[PDB]
Design a protein around this ligand. Structure first.
Ligand SMILES: *[C@H](O)[C@H](C[C@@H]1CCNC1=O)NC(=O)[C@@H]1[C@@H]2[C@H](CN1C(=O)C(c1ccc(Cl)cc1)c1ccc(Cl)cc1)C2(C)C
Ligand SMILES: *[C@H](O)[C@H](C[C@@H]1CCNC1=O)NC(=O)[C@@H]1[C@@H]2[C@H](CN1C(=O)C(c1ccc(Cl)cc1)c1ccc(Cl)cc1)C2(C)C
Lengths: 306, 306
């Protein structure tokens, strides 16, 4: 037993991480086969980043301007192109550590692991959720751009995020690996704002089921509720609407615990209206919303990756 | 900016993890050079585990009884010995992925990363602290024994924990890599209990400094306090005494923020006496104690590992 915010083992991604320097900008790149992917704002100077014209900036660049460091071995860039907000640097060497992979774009409410990197060297790994407002609550300092987010399924790494910037509230914005931003953000150094967030209701319910599985039962009740009546309470407390597909997705957890989904909704209702009255759930005094039903099933049953 | 519970990149440890099966017990082993380390209770049957005599049990074993799986390659065991509560299985192949390493034993209050493993395959990575009562609040299911805890310093893996068992409160107990248990626990299937825990005061203060660095300031005050007067409050709320060495260790964070250590103690005092009044600190509604001053400095400055 026990329930922890758990990242995927990072080894497969560590072997892909490189350093990209151009001018006086250094960031991280992702090296897969013979391409290095990195944020396109590596081509920017300080006065470029205020409102850059990246097509103009890129045509003025040369292959030799891009210094790519794979550990202590320099990678010769032999071609370069832009795809949306990422650069694709063609190098003369295929990464022998290239895992099997996919470029996927995730939905708000879904989670992934971030391998935070500086100077092409991994620093730490942690779990993030894509917020409903398309930001992520990460831990990123200068130099972390090009760090990626990913999930692992069996032996296959699904890359879903590349880091680009921090917003004024201290949350983080970036792209999928096709270079398309999550949310209404641009890689331009100009006042942008996240936009109002909501709590991921289906995830809170999943975490309540994790708690029950692990012996925390004090918030359970005999009460039940209808889906419609629950959603009137959810809307008031700035929670996302719960759909019938959410109910269906929670089915396995409901069956394992023997607590009907709508019964757990009644419990969440009371927690929302009453608070926790000094008690905790899985070591938290807040309702936690960055575990998906999948995350709970993985951890509370024991899935691995090879 | 941002502050997350962050584990070390796990790649170096992933390359060491193997499957050890003996009889109908399967667990994980740690393969370094030509030795596989694993919990000695792998030699136990169901009626053995109730109160086993491990020396008797081991002399009845043969090298060929130990099936070691390194991925899809079988490792031939050529010798075996017991060291305290771990077994050392001598194999005919040195692990070519052996990182530089050390076997260290950590102190209560210190943190480490756990690579949770099943059937020799890594499942997830997360950060733990050694509680004052020598337990850890982990996430471990059947089959996870032999998973290790570690820190990484530059290129060197300091192994500090091997997982052995869960206690009746759902917390976890294990050994250092010399096979010596943390705390007053034995690898015997008989009623044991954790013993009363305390909150790691110096870590809470470190986390309060992390919060200030990241813009959370509402708990700050003009008040100050003496170390003695603080410790009278700490004792009441079941917090560990703060020592002058703790104050010294917090010096850098104090200097970065410009908040004297004893001033932050005055803030913690009010938080302990008043609670949080509906507010949060770094996304938590509880005072968090599993970040060390080192952890805060690493994350809020950007140290990597190669
Ligand atoms: C890439 O290494 C870097 C990572 C950020 C630094 C601090 N936290 C990060 O995640 N990204 C950037 O430097 C981007 C790129 C120029 C500016 N920028 C920023 O994140 C700064 C910034 C972003 C957005 C706006 Cl509208 C203004 C400035 C920034 C934000 C917050 C802090 Cl604390 C420092 C710097 C860019 C092309 C957007
Ligand atoms: C090793 O894979 C396994 C890991 C534990 C299973 C559940 N959580 C774990 O961390 N460890 C064990 O199976 C140990 C070894 C025999 C019994 N055991 C236990 O952890 C069970 C147990 C421990 C201690 C006592 Cl006093 C009685 C039983 C145990 C505890 C809790 C649960 Cl939920 C299941 C099983 C052993 C030699 C101690």
């Amino acid at each position: 037993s026990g329930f922890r915010k758990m990242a995927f083992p990072s080894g497969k991604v560590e072997g892909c991480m490189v350093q990209v320097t151009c001018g006086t900008t250094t960031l991280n790149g992702l090296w897969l086969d013979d391409v290095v992917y990195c944020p396109r704002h590596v081509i920017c100077t300080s006065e470029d980043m205020l409102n850059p014209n990246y097509e103009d900036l890129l045509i003025r660049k040369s292959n030799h301007n891009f210094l790519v460091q794979a550990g202590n071995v320099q990678l010769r860039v032999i071609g370069h192109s832009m795809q949306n907000c990422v650069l694709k640097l063609k190098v003369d060497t295929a990464n022998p550590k290239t895992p099997k992979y996919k470029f996927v774009r995730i939905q708000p409410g879904q989670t992934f692991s971030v391998l935070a990197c500086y100077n092409g060297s991994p620093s730490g790994v942690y779990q993030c959720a894509m917020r409903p407002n398309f930001t992520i609550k990460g831990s990123f300092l200068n130099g972390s751009c090009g760090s990626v987010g990913f999930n692992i399924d069996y032996d296959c790494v699904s890359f879903c995020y590349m880091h680009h910037m921090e917003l004024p509230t201290g949350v983080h914005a970036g792209t999928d690996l096709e270079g398309n931003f999550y949310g209404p953000f641009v890689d331009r150094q100009t006042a942008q704002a996240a936009g109002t967030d909501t709590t991921i209701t289906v995830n809170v319910l999943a975490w309540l089921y994790a708690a029950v599985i692990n012996g925390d039962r004090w918030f359970l009740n005999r009460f039940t509720t209808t889906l419609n009546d629950f959603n009137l309470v959810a809307m008031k407390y700035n929670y996302e609407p719960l759909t019938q597909d959410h109910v269906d997705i929670l089915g396995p957890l409901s069956a394992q615990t023997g607590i009907a989904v709508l019964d757990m909704c009644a419990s969440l209702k009371e927690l929302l209206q009453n608070g926790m009255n000094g008690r905790t759930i899985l070591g938290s005094a807040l309702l936690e919303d960055e575990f998906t039903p999948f995350d709970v099933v993985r951890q509370c049953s024991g899935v691995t990756f090879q």
